[PDB]
Amino acid sequence: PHRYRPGTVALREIRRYQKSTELLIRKLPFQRLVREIAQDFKTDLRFQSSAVMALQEASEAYLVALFEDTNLCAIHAKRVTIMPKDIQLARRIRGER
């Protein structure tokens, strides 16, 4: 019958994930994604492994920066819950679209 007040697990996971560094997305689905969208530019390539790790690091850092600027937007609109008009606002302001 013991359950937390909602939000506590959220904040402790925030601290638990900021106190560590690792690859965060599971590696083989991301590798299959990279090969599948590299199909369209030159058929039957041959990657190395370190290039795939470099892509995973670049994409992970880009998503983290995007979500922090999204969270700034959502706190600015006197809300807490992130809605995708925040993300579209952030990529409209930053200049990528």
């Binding site: 190395q48 892509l55 670049a58």
Partner: protein
């Protein structure tokens, strides 16, 4: 030939990147918008990587090509090559 792998990015993994971003509470459309933005960024990198690989006549995309493409983008990844 492959399929469906853009859904290989799961539901909790986007939630984990949100938690490292420092985010309390997520809606249900962020998954679709996130897969869209991630696919756009990966196409804009892999185009220039494969362009370098075709110019240097090889059939292999090393880490140095990815770092050269990211140097052109304006992100400048360290720690490889």
């Amino acid at each position: 030939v492959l399929r469906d792998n853009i859904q290989g990015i799961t539901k909790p993994a986007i939630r984990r990147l949100a938690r490292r971003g420092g985010v309390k509470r997520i809606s249900g459309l962020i998954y679709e918008e996130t897969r869209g933005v991630l696919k756009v960024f990966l196409e804009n990198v892999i185009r220039d990587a494969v362009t370098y690989t075709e110019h240097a006549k090889r059939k292999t995309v090393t880490a140095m090509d990815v770092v050269y493409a990211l140097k052109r983008q304006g992100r400048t990844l360290y720690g490889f090559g």
